[PDB]
RNA sequence: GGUCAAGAUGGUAAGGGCCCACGGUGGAUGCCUCGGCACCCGAGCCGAUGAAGGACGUGGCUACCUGCGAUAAGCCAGGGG
RNA sequence: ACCGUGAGGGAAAGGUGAAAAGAACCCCGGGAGGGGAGUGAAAUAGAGCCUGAAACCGUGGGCUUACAAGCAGUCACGGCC
RNA sequence: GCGAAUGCCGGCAUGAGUAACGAUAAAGAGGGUGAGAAUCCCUCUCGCCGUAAGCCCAAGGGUUCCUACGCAAUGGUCGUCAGCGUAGGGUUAGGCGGGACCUAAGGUGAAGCCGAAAGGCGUAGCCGAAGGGCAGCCGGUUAAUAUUCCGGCCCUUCCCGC
RNA sequence: GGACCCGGUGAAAUUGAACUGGCCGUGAAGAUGCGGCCUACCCGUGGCAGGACGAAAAGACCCCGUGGAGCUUUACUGCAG
RNA sequence: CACCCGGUGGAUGGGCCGGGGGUGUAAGCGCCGCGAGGCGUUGAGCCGACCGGUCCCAAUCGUCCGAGGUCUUGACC
């Protein structure tokens, strides 16, 4: 049942440009809170435990 | 400058590009930590790809950090050729396809 | 509906017992509150007080444990006993944010 | 659904079996001509 | 040297189009052969002394291919080596 | 092999090298796979590994791109390379 | 000597990182293993069956069953999990079922009867089944078997002797 | 409960090619691509169906091939009985 | 998505707290009847977003990017 479908070999061209708008843009990350290291901006994790109390591990 | 690689690699070529097209020509160390805390699979991979290639280098490319990568590349081959619903008649199959996964590594 | 409930359930249930447990975003940012709630009762501490608490969690060792157990080392303050972190990682194929809360101690 | 299929050990065995075949004018024929003509197996054999 | 008023040119590209260099993906291709095809000279019956054709079967250690079959990669006799 | 209950249909797929000398050992890695050493005339000859073209996906570079129409484009004139 | 036959064969792009996860019987938490676990193991809340989403006999399919290793692809995501890979191992009966007994349909079929040949029919006898007939049951016991292996209790047919 | 935003996977018929605007006119007589004109930046995602004479299928309704196939009777002939 | 207000020198979420609204006097003990129940305590209890207090809780700490002032003519200080 396709009723519609495409008409007219989409265009490499365009098709990408298209998938054009696309793109990633690095985690905003920042950096230990005394952990020394670069972090999920607002955690701690396997550097921290920290934060301000010691909820964690290592 | 050295480099990493590794192809029969099971994955989204497509996917795998945004990968890189990030960390992509910049400090080492330093992106180590984009795909150490960014997202999508590939990651995982990419970064791998990224440590026998430090390692390479220095070990037998030879001065560490003061790298990075002049460049980094992935391409897409060998295919998966996967088998879906007869057109509840006629066969539809996807693929996976395969994929590259090259990388520079080069000092400062 | 039924489901929104049993959640806050066993997860108020299981938390209590540990208290800080490792769920997302927000279904820790809600057994909040609500668990939280529960608690202010647990301080309430009575009859009644007790005949709710239970009502949902249903389980006497518990149940009581809190009541009396915390309870205490709570009746001062004014609501918040629990302290909702937010967490590093992400439940994979997912990608989910989970998140880990406890009572603020 | 009921296809066609359900086999019959029973059945189908019966039904077609080296045998009959054999029995068989035509059966045979074709048969033999399987045979060389082909290789393989037959029936029955299945 | 600052201010207003006008008048015209420029850089900046998310992807994009063309040209170049280097991969990947894909196998065309040439060349090649243990295989066919084709025509000519040789040859022309097997069978209960259960055939042609299979079945299950031994290799020390195993599916297949094989040659045999229970005396199963083989047992005797003569010729070649 | 494979679809067919059956009679029947009926595919695709060959190529390293002079010979393996077929990659001990060390490296990132859960591995595959990638970095060195060694064979070597050459391994971008490296294990579906001779020639290995096109289509098609990439990585850099030149030029070019935001008051603009036509697949095309081709004639003129201009600037960058 | 080829665009070009909705041509044949092979590859390769489209739509497109949108459409789908095969029943709206939901989950969530703690610990454990692992290079790596929403998707595995233990555990604790919770939901769905319950005439089934129960065990059982069959027919069909045939190692898919267990155990130790392992995840390349198949598992429409993962995956240390598998009804996936390799290796080893597993299912024993005088009395259960099939035969060593019986025939209807039907099929065969010495004789007999008719065909251009191949063939047709077809007596008796034979083939033919959860229909007839026939001598046991309960507990234990491994990673798998069990009315068969254990043991306790119950039998049948044939043979030789007296 | 999908649809939408995330992460994991990841098809499908049709399609010469294409950067495809409205107008009023036109041509083979119902044009984004031809003429004149008017609006007109480059890309996208959530949508809404109108046009691309959209997709599906070399019209079944039609006629044309001194095509075919089935039933009919005081059609032609011939056989069975 | 963009768009608005806030980011502990905060009242932004929740929490609590008063307030309203909403359900019709609760859990318990009490007192009447063999029981069923009732009557009381008790307009109780319980309260989802509505109006507003209070730093219990949770918006910590941190990054990145961003100007300089293009060419001619003249009018005035």
Known sequence: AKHPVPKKKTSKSKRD???????????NLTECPQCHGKKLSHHICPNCGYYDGRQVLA | ????????????????????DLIRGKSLEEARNILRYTNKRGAYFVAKVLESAAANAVNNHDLEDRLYVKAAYVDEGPALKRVLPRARGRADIIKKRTSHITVILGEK | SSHRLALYRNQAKSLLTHGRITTTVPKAKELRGFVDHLIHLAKRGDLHAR???????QDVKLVRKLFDEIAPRYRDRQGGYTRVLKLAERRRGDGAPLALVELVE | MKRTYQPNNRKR????????????????????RRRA????????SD
């Open chain 2, 1 to 20: 400058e050295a480099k990493a690689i590794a192809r029969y690699v099971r994955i989204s070529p497509r996917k795998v590009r945004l990968v890189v």
């Open chain 1, 17 to 27: 440009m298209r998938r054009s708008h696309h793109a990633l843009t690095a985690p």
């Open chain 4, 37 to 44: 003509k082909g290789r393989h197996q037959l029936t029955v």
């Open chain 4, 13 to 32: 065995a019966k039904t077609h079996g080296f045998r009959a075949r054999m029995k068989t004018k035509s059966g045979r024929n074709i048969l033999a």
């Open chain 3, 51 to 57: 005949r709710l608490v239970l009502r949902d969690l």
